[PDB]
Design a protein around this ligand. Structure first.
Ligand code: FMN
Ligand code: FMN
Ligand code: 4NB
Ligand code: 4NB
Lengths: 216, 216
């Protein structure tokens, strides 16, 4: 039951470095990243999946100093996922999305692809010409992916914690993201919690439905 | 299997208006909205859940005219969820969150409570004061909730579709959201698809892992 998963998943504060994901679980978490929905199927994202000791150490550099309370989570987890968003939405990216949709068989004619290209253009240029908030629009799609991801890994029986407490300028420079057209937004260590995870035994806390929900 | 869910769920293009959620399902989708994670457990959100015909008609006003292609989806679904973000992070909301955490038993001393409140204020001030982007920061948490929600309702065997194609100004006015301190971001009709949901039999399409993932 997915509600049981939602009530039992929690943000892990400490990971057991000896408990690694299986090869099968490693493939499943990449499938989760890939198949998240996004506005107009824009998929405006890139993921760094660090599983070697050196790779995780490179990610953990972003937690040095002020964010040190997040550094050990990145070092001790089995896999660490860096969620990145595109910095600008270009036509080339939109062309590759619609061509992939054709390759996967979503169009029955060279007509319907011209209409899907016509549609995704009017939508994206609204954020590039007019609103000029396509940077924030793409980052929102990445946060949607994070929310999909956290529930999915919980359903797999894996522990995780989402992290905003890191230096994105440091992380971007370490992986050369800016020149690639990406910027890091959220880091998610994935693995199994240790006995030092004090948050595993604390009750969950949320505002009541009478506050957050209006029915009509 | 949650991966089967991720590969099976789709954006429904048309809903069967005769098929309603059960009472138990209606409670479960509210639990999903409630228990989504968020940065510092800030829960900067409110949800309109329209299930009556008059309520759904009120939400559907935001799809009239320019966004007419989304209007029937709102009218036909069993339940329509409006995801709303706070427009500003005020100190009273932060106090409300920490008071709820105390009521739920997450602190063992009053000093533990004040320390948690001090930390949440510090990180909120990073967005309110330094970055001056708390409005975008809170919207990102709401998008994370949507991503959690879409996978959860798919795991319940329910159809849904996320919608950005609506007039948020019209929707905010219809429900007085701006004066209440909120703004609408995403509309999600939930129910069961009809024969007119052409997307139900199309294959899913995503960019390949060679493009979106870097392993290290
Ligand atoms: C986007 C985001 C960023 C977060 N950043 C951190 C973080 O930097 N360090 C941390 O320990 N927890 C972080 N959290 C975890 C939250 O404190 C946690 O999700 C919230 O208190 C709800 O608890 P739960 O995840 O156990 O349900 C973050 C959560 C989200 C969604
Ligand atoms: C934030 C968001 C907004 C979307 N807005 C619309 C919309 O307004 N109308 C619509 O029919 N589909 C909308 N979609 C659906 C996307 O086109 C769809 O998620 C994407 O093509 C991937 O396909 P899937 O959801 O079937 O996996 C939206 C999706 C997201 C995540
Ligand atoms: O108007 C829009 O913002 C809009 C966004 C997404 C989609 N879509 O994903 O089909 C359509 C319209
Ligand atoms: O952005 C941060 O530094 C940050 C730190 C802690 C948390 N948190 O504990 O949820 C969230 C964000």
């Amino acid at each position: 039951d997915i509600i049981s998963v939602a009530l039992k998943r929690h943000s892990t504060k400490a990971f057991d470095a000896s408990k690694k994901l299986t090869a099968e679980e490693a493939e499943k978490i990449k499938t989760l990243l890939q198949y998240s929905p996004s506005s107009t199927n824009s998929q405006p994202w890139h993921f760094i999946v660090a599983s070697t000791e050196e790779g995780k150490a490179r990610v953990a550099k972003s937690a040095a100093g002020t964010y040190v309370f997040n550094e050990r989570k990145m070092l001790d987890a089995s896999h660490v996922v860096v969620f990145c968003a595109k910095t600008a939405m270009d036509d080339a990216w939109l062309e590759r999305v619609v061509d992939q949709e054709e390759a996967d068989g979503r169009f029955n004619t060279p007509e319907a692809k011209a209409a899907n290209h016509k549609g995704r253009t009017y939508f994206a240029d609204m954020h590039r010409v007019d609103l000029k908030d396509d940077d924030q629009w793409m980052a929102k799609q990445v946060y949607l992916n994070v929310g999909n991801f956290l529930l999915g890994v919980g359903a797999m029986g894996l522990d995780a914690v989402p992290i905003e407490g890191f230096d994105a300028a440091i992380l971007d420079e370490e992986f050369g993201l800016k020149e690639k057209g990406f910027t890091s937004l959220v880091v998610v260590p994935v693995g199994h919690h240790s006995v030092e995870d004090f948050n595993a035994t604390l009750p969950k806390s949320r505002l009541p439905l009478s506050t957050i929900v209006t029915e009509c």
